[PDB]
Amino acid sequence: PMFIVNTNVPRASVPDGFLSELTQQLAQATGKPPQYIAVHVVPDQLMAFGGSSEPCALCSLHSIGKIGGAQNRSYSKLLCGLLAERLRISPDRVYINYYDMNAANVGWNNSTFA
Amino acid sequence: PMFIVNTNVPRASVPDGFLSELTQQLAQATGKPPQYIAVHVVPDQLMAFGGSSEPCALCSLHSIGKIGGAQNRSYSKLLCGLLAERLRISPDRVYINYYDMNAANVGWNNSTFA
Amino acid sequence: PMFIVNTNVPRASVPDGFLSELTQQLAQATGKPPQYIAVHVVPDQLMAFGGSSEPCALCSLHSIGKIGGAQNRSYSKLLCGLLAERLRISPDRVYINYYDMNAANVGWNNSTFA
């Protein structure tokens, strides 16, 4: 998994340990080793959700498989959970776009995963 | 709709009002309640288009359906129009990537839209 | 092609001419005129790869065609190569998501490419 969070929450509100926590929890959730997982948090963004500038997040999760109805519902519960607990963002002010990438369409280490 | 604009125009050149305007215009254009609409503007970016650092924008619009030939042509007119009028970006220096998301592949409120 | 790189490398470490070099090299790789090529570099990011905050990058390449097994392998070698040489990022700490966009789903100059 690679997970990207873009939020209007300020940098000083992202707690120490957050990228490590995301990494571990995504490892646990996907049954994938943590060495594969990438995470990225972009705070201080100029964003709105429903025309409001209260805390919100626009996120992406990309995986090579392990994407599907049930799996995505569990990922959304985990990730909204974390964003609510650590960043004080309401789950109904979060979108997470999920992408099932073909191995041939993911570059890594001078080649692809195909 | 959720609309993201990345641009090398400076923060101070983004009008107060712009996120609200995008939200309202997007609501009009899609017929979606504005409560569902998210917008995000990212100024000051290190970017080039055609090798030039003249104002430009890289954007995305994600929707659950309501994406297709005619619809995307109308969105591109609307959104290039706004970026030209408000951020003084030439329409020929804008890209908009459109994504028709499956409901099961959009997380929100601890679950998905499926 | 449009290429976006997000990295925890600091802005001061991005050398002069980097966006110009990406443009020119992407033109060469895809055969496409540099005039349509967009590039975007986002340094100083809060990111981790494999649970580690060593230099890393998460990137995307969108093209209307010119995406496929061998092409993307070639692009990955090219781009990981530039990121290593210029930003001192190890190739094994780079992910590049490739997107073959339908021409109907790419907005430019008030319309789409369909």
Numbering used by the authors:
A (entry chain C), B (entry chain A), C (entry chain B): 2 to 115
Sentences from the paper on this structure:
Macrophage migration inhibitory factor (MIF) is expressed at high levels in various inflammatory diseases and cancer. Macrophage migration inhibitory factor promotes directional cell migration (or chemotaxis) of various cell types 2, 3, 4. Unlike canonical cytokines and chemokines, a trimeric MIF molecule has three tautomerase active sites at the trimer interfaces 23. Although the enzymatic activity is vestigial, there is accumulating evidence that the active site is important for receptor binding 24, 25.
To structurally verify the proposal for the inhibition of p110γ and p101 expression, we co‐crystallized 1, 2 and 12 with MIF. 1 occupies the bottom half of the catalytic pocket, whereas 2 occupies the upper half. However, this steric hindrance theory does not explain the inhibition of MIF‐induced migration of THP‐1 cells and HL60 cells by 1 that does not have any solvent‐exposed ring structure like 2. In contrast, MIF:ISO‐1, MIF:1 and MIF:2 show relatively increased B‐factors (>10 Å2, >30 Å2, and >25 Å2 respectively) for the L2 loop. As MIF:1, MIF:2 and MIF:ISO‐1 inhibited MIF‐induced leucocyte migration and increased B‐factors in L2, it is likely that structural stability of L2 is the critical structural determinant for the chemoattractant activity of MIF. Pro1 attached to 1 revealed the longest displacement (1.9 Å) followed by 4‐IPP (1.1 Å), 2 (0.8 Å), 12 (0.5 Å) and ISO‐1 (0.4 Å). This suggests that 1 might disturb the protein the most. The displacements are 1.1 Å for 1, 0.6 Å for 4‐IPP, 0.6 Å for 2 and 0.5 Å for ISO‐1 and 0.2 Å for 12. This suggests that the displacement of Pro1 upon inhibitor binding within the tight active site pushes and destabilizes the L2 loop, resulting in suboptimal MIF binding to receptor. 1 inhibited 79% of the total number of neutrophils otherwise recruited by MIF.
